Amino acid sequence: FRAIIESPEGAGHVGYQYRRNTGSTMRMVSDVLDERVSLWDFHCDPSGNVIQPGPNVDSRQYLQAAIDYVSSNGGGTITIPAGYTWYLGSYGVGGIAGHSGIIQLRSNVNLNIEGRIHLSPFFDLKPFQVFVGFDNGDPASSGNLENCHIYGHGVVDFGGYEFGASSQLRNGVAFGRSYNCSVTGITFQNGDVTWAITLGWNGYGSNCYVRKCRFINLVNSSVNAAHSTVYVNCPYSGVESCYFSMSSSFARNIACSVALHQHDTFYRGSTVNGYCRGAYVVMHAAEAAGAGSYAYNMQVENNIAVIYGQFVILGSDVTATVSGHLNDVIVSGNIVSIGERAAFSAPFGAFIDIGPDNSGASNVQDIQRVLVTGNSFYAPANITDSAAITLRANLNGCTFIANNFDCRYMVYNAPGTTSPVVQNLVWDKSNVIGGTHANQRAGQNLFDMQFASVVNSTIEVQLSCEDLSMFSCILFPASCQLSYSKITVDSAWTKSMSNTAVFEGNQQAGANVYVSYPATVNLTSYNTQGAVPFFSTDTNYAWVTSAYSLSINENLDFSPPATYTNKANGQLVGVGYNEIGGVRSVSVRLMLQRQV
Amino acid sequence: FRAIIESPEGAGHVGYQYRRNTGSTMRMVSDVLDERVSLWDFHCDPSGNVIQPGPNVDSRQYLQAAIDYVSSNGGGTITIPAGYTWYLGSYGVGGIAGHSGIIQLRSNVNLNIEGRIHLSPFFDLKPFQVFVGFDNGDPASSGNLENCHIYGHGVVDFGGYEFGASSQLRNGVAFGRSYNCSVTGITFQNGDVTWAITLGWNGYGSNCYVRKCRFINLVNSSVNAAHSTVYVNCPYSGVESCYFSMSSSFARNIACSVALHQHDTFYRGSTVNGYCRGAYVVMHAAEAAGAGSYAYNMQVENNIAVIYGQFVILGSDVTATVSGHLNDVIVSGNIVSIGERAAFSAPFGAFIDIGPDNSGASNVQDIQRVLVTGNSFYAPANITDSAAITLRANLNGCTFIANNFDCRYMVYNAPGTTSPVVQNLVWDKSNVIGGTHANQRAGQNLFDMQFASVVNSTIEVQLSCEDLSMFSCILFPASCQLSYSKITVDSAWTKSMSNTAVFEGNQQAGANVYVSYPATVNLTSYNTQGAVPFFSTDTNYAWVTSAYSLSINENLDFSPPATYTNKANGQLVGVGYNEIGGVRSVSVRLMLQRQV
Amino acid sequence: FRAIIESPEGAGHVGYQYRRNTGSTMRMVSDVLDERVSLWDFHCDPSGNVIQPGPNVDSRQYLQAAIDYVSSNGGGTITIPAGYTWYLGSYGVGGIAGHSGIIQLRSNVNLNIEGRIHLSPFFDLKPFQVFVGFDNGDPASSGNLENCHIYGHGVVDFGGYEFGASSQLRNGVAFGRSYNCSVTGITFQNGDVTWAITLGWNGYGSNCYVRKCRFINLVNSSVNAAHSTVYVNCPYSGVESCYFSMSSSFARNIACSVALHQHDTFYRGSTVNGYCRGAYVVMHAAEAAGAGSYAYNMQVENNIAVIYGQFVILGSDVTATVSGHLNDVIVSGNIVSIGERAAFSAPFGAFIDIGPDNSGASNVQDIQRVLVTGNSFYAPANITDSAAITLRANLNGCTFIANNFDCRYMVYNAPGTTSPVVQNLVWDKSNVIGGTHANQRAGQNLFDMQFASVVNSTIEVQLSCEDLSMFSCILFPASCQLSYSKITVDSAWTKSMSNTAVFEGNQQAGANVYVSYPATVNLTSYNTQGAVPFFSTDTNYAWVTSAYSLSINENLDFSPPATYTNKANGQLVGVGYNEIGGVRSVSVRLMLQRQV
Ligand SMILES: CC(=O)N[C@@H]1[C@@H](O[C@H]2O[C@H](CO)[C@H](O[C@H]3O[C@H](CO[C@@H]4O[C@@H](C)[C@H](O)[C@@H](O)[C@H]4O)[C@@H](O)[C@H](O)[C@H]3O)[C@H](O[C@@H]3O[C@H](CO)[C@@H](O)[C@H](O)[C@H]3NC(C)=O)[C@H]2O)[C@H](O)[C@@H](CO[C@H]2O[C@H](CO)[C@@H](O)[C@H](O)[C@H]2O)O[C@@H]1O
Ligand SMILES: CC(=O)N[C@@H]1[C@@H](O[C@H]2O[C@H](CO)[C@H](O[C@H]3O[C@H](CO[C@@H]4O[C@@H](C)[C@H](O)[C@@H](O)[C@H]4O)[C@@H](O)[C@H](O)[C@H]3O)[C@H](O[C@@H]3O[C@H](CO)[C@@H](O)[C@H](O)[C@H]3NC(C)=O)[C@H]2O)[C@H](O)[C@@H](CO[C@H]2O[C@H](CO)[C@@H](O)[C@H](O)[C@H]2O)O[C@@H]1O
Ligand SMILES: CC(=O)N[C@@H]1[C@@H](O[C@H]2O[C@H](CO)[C@H](O[C@H]3O[C@H](CO[C@@H]4O[C@@H](C)[C@H](O)[C@@H](O)[C@H]4O)[C@@H](O)[C@H](O)[C@H]3O)[C@H](O[C@@H]3O[C@H](CO)[C@@H](O)[C@H](O)[C@H]3NC(C)=O)[C@H]2O)[C@H](O)[C@@H](CO[C@H]2O[C@H](CO)[C@@H](O)[C@H](O)[C@H]2O)O[C@@H]1O
Ligand code: NA
Ligand code: NA
Ligand code: NA
């Protein structure tokens, strides 16, 4: 009996009944203790003696034994205890070896990480994926991971080790073909990794989430090829209320916070600092196996960001046998800025980027039904490479309403690069254009329409302050076709502008182009006393349907017409009034209109 | 002593002091074990022997005993253990019997559901409410439920059983007259039920919430009369970050995700697929006892939905002695689509529906001060029955700003049905109208104003692409009165339209109607050389205050006026210019304006 | 052995192995029990006998001993047990004494509050701060608090005691110089306090959050000087999904829900009732030590509020050696109302307030790049003191897009008070002005521009119903300079208004002022048959660049011009048509335009 009690079965001989309640189960202490489980229950030598964790102990095999055992009972939650750091010092074996895996996750087995998990220097200059939910080296032959949650106040620390080679991959949690899996509360820090968390695999998975996590300093070297903190690769999944921070120079050029790569995915309520990019919103044809060829219902909302490159990047692409499509996207309520940097010192600053594929192709995309609304964007005045939208690949539609954009360009694409085919670009008059870059725009077009063609598009320019440095508010080169479009420039703050809208190929003459913009025009009247015609001296107004005065008349003896039409020879003409006769000659600011 | 130790009081004789700290309490093992409690502590036969759960064991009485006992000590949290399925196989007794209750919840007693709870086939074809917080068969004589939280990674499974009769009710959690109650984390699945969760009772309750829950496949038969997944019937309560999915055909016709039925309630950040409806936002007079006759401060924001009928349904109604009012509503940031379906195959597709009462009355409602802003809506091109708003009952105000609506109709109501009285309908120019339904609109009016009357309303139509199939952009039948309103049609993409705005009762002539829209007009001049008048051949322009040219002048020898007014006989008239004399006859596209 | 077993070391002699697994650690019961810790482990007399909590027991020393001990082991989570109320009855000692501290928090030591914590009457009429994370009386010499989380279903009750003197301070949780600290789930109630929670100290701290907490009735007396429920004084921190309620009259005059006082801070998804104010968004120079002199990336989104004063208050100020700046702010998606009250009975109602500093100075502020978008605001018709913006101090920019404001004023500042210098105030046409206050505006200007100067501003007024009671839609006194601005009044619902826009100093004549608004003008023609001029009888139109008819022509024999320009003497002039000759005299409603 003494022997039984001191034995490992002792607690199984000590009776217990909850709160002395006579209606409660007559149990043994061991039954109640068996209701919970921790790493300490597996962190022992072959004789069953507990092993203290530390920098010289590899905890991997013990944590794997705990997970495997709990898995065998239909699941539960293993605690990783507070007040200790648990080092990992070797790779795992079996199915996860193909993924450079350390720990293998299993279905229904949750991890409550309250202490710290820290990679030992065995992993320096090596690939690794700390937690892996695949059960096979080939993800295509992998089983699923279901009902696996990682949560707590603890920490995953990547030991500060740099990558050994750019081709290597490193990850924190790869859930795999993951259904109802989540990470909540955890801080991931101090590394050089590719991703912190990945959700799903090529569309297989569902209901995976990352909530209230922190990601701190996860890129640190020039070796690191690329980094996206959370890659969402299964539908009905997302990231909310997270914090992302980088301090490395390299992060400003390579790091993105989130990738939304399947339908019905979201990125909300998060704060980003020190990253190149905010989010990719993409349908890769190569990733279309699990959930189809369409990324739709994509939501980026209510985030706060300081970045160095582009906030949201839109794209879709193709393989030999699959074509990716991106549609039904909303980007709203975000407040974003380009951090303090030299012009051209990081990838081109943008709120929205329509990005060419990984091979640089701009003629594979199928991006449409995007709404960008109620966001703020700001870039410091020196950052020439800042745009509301860098439209660098084919676009089948994007709508901008009620944003506030305060940067160098509104619409931009580099000339002599790609020549995008643009459809259904809508820029509503309710987009407010800020003045931070006023006086910086010598030689530049606010809306620089460097495309192959534009159709079914609306650009309603409204200034809110003067910028007389700019070459034009909007310019179309002669190589850009323009049809079935509406282009207007409001006259406010434009009286002293030489050029307002510029159509280098006279594209505003098109049958279904509807335009209006201010221009200065010289007119000369006949000498007749009374009602008298005034005609423009130049003949380039054959496209104008009406025009009206934007200038006061300093004269007593006559007045020019208030309104004008045109004539077949391209003159404007209207009827004014000579109180006394005489040939008149005036220079007037007019609002030129065509079909509006 | 051996006997004491092996007895149920044994743990109460084994001393313990935390971490051997001499300043800590000298306790017994049983005291520490008594800090927590699980179902295992009550899941026992009359001799105190533990009973294993399973499909042949009814766990109800044991779980009730646990709840009752914990309640007696001022509360706590009972764990429903992971790795087991706990079947429920009988109804409860007492107060919850009137609600077909299984388990009775009690104040301060939380349930941490980590395992699975599953209904046994005793419940097939029967009503049931799994967890009930009422303590009396008559909710009016019920006490309150306070401080009751249900949370964890577990599951409530409704066993797949169909309803027996349409008149039956089924629910997961009925909190009752519920104050500071919540459900977090739980998956509700595999049923045919009326609701999964209900919060409050006829306005009694407060601070009830449903967060990070999943609701999967909860309608499965033609017997089911109706389904709303969460019914919010107490103020200061809401639903956030939930997932809702249905696969049944019947769900596309009967199921709604959320009902917000009292003031200061919200539905946010959620994803919906396979449902008929997104949310009801309603003040039922019959439900006004607990929190007054007004539903105000109602918020539907940042949701993602694929539905088959209507996204938000607005309503209010009356009883013999109470009148319901709905006001101060915001609908923002939502991205919604009608899923792939045949036209007319499910209830009429809509972003907003102003719905008649349960008896079909359209003259009881008092709905006003609604803001719909920054949402996206899409319906596939074949779905004739798709509208931004189906305005089917009296409306005292609704404001639309900066949305993107891509469907068949903008404003719709069926002719020869209800004749709503409309006030303060505001459709701002910043609403972008998509082109998916271009070419599908033969015989149809984009804004089909099938009302009794319209007052104090604004409709600013702006197209962003051509649709020459439509009969008109906006049409008022002669039975619709129109007064103190502004109606405009921007000219862009309208040059080839026969009809733009149509006023079948010539209602645009009204003293306080402010309109503008394009029209083609034939004019004929006098023969006089010089300044010469042009007059319209038709006499239907007595209401026009000015008009201006939207056409170029192909002539050298003359020009028509740029601008026109009218004359008492209903002609337009303006002054053009004959370089050489002669009677002129032209057909010109004009922008007709009245008081704008 | 019997003796050992009954001793405090007994559990350390009883063997245990998890679930009888031969691969598990051979432990003792005490090891498993040592995995968790509660207040009961420290709530004991000097002989180690447990003490029951209650109104006559001071639990403070015991809870401090628990925290100190857990801190010594590298942290963990102490449970404050459910089913008991734990009273605090004395002040703490050491570093927190300077802060009137009760309990001292320590790094990595979390509190899981499931029971109730309640202040005893020792604290009546006294200052107190219940939980304090500073370790020194002087916050400047304090160490940090890291990784401290307070969570659970429990309650902190302040005992209902009033303040003794207005100069006293009271707080719930002062995290101090706080990094990765949070409060989740807790209800704070029944007090008269200054704050419930404060985060950070003068910019020192990071990643502090308050989530899913309730704050109920925390002001109760006329003695209380001021109250803000959560004060956020460190960056990368915020408040989400909280509930705030007050019932006291005094709260309607003194209480604010949140203060956002450092960069990258947020307030989201919360509900407020009974408060004076929603949120301060402020950069105090005096608080600039820890995180710099700029508050930027400030976010107030998706809140629901009933308040009595101002929803968001913007400000910045200076000290002898530091200047505060506020920029890059977003206010979106909020639905707010002024609760039922008499006019002038609480501080002036406002959605946005640009507030002078604590000394009343209006010439210290540097507030710019603010976006206010997609919000709703409502005040009952009797509340004269209600404005979309009360602009009472210097403003360097604020942008309003796509809001719905239904109150007395749109833009307001009291005349004969402060004279703000205003730059970059942008009021887009997409702001919808409600009609609740129609007919209440005798003697009042909808936009009452009571400033020193206005520059680089846009005000686009659009009515949606008639209000003929108002004196004007917009008025500039002669003391307000106006330059490089755009001011328009849409004609809809304005035909019967005497005054639309009023420029008491004729400021619309300015070279870079762009305006348009309706006016009635009397004209007289020459007698000539045919094309004939009409001239205004008054000479105050020297600033007008064009005008056009907003009136029908009731005549057959002639028509006035459709469009007009001006003449140097300030007449308008245009060319109409006399079918028969004769001098004509008409009164016409025109749209007057200047440079637009
Ligand atoms: C770091 C990052 O996320 N970058 C984005 C680009 O992603 C792509 O490059 C990545 C570089 O790391 C990834 O490729 C790498 O990893 C692949 C997967 O690893 C294998 O399979 C795993 C399941 C195993 O555990 C591993 O052991 C290994 O076997 C590997 O095949 C590639 O060779 C390697 O370079 C990334 O690949 C994806 O990763 C996720 C997450 O782990 C996984 O779920 C997917 O299965 C996998 N996809 C594929 C196809 O294998 C790869 O996608 C990304 O392409 C780019 C988006 O922008 C560009 O394209 C847009 C659309 O055309 C265009 O709009 C834009 O302008 C372009 O810049 O963004 C980041 O750069
Ligand atoms: C399924 C659903 O939610 N449908 C919505 C309509 O709700 C209404 O019909 C429901 C059908 O199930 C409910 O009625 C049923 O249940 C009633 C309540 O059950 C009793 O009381 C419970 C507390 C007990 O536990 C039960 O044992 C039982 O005793 C019952 O009285 C009815 O006879 C039965 O048909 C629903 O009733 C409400 O349910 C909630 C949640 O449980 C409860 O808190 C309320 O007390 C209770 N209300 C009432 C009045 O009893 C009943 O409301 C809903 O009316 C409709 C809204 O849209 C229509 O009306 C709008 C406003 O005029 C209009 O804009 C719109 O166009 C219309 O379609 O939406 C769903 O159909
Ligand atoms: C109640 C509230 O929050 N009111 C807002 C104003 O805040 C300011 O007044 C408060 C009155 O309580 C605070 O001052 C009081 O407390 C100070 C701090 O206490 C000391 O230091 C603590 C760390 C210790 O634990 C204490 O023991 C004590 O030693 C004290 O120095 C003052 O004497 C006392 O009156 C508040 O002070 C701040 O509090 C936070 C939170 O605890 C702390 O992190 C800060 O260190 C501390 N700040 C300073 C400078 O010490 C003090 O800021 C607030 O000023 C006002 C904002 O609006 C006005 O100014 C705007 C900007 O110009 C302008 O736009 C607007 O129109 C103005 O009305 O809002 C509330 O009234
Ligand atoms: Na691999
Ligand atoms: Na769109
Ligand atoms: Na081209």
Ligand code: NA
């Ligand atoms: Na009943």
Ligand code: NA
């Ligand atoms: Na409204």
Ligand code: NA
């Ligand atoms: Na009628």
Ligand code: NA
């Ligand atoms: Na102090």
Ligand code: NA
């Ligand atoms: Na702004």
Ligand code: NA
């Ligand atoms: Na002045």
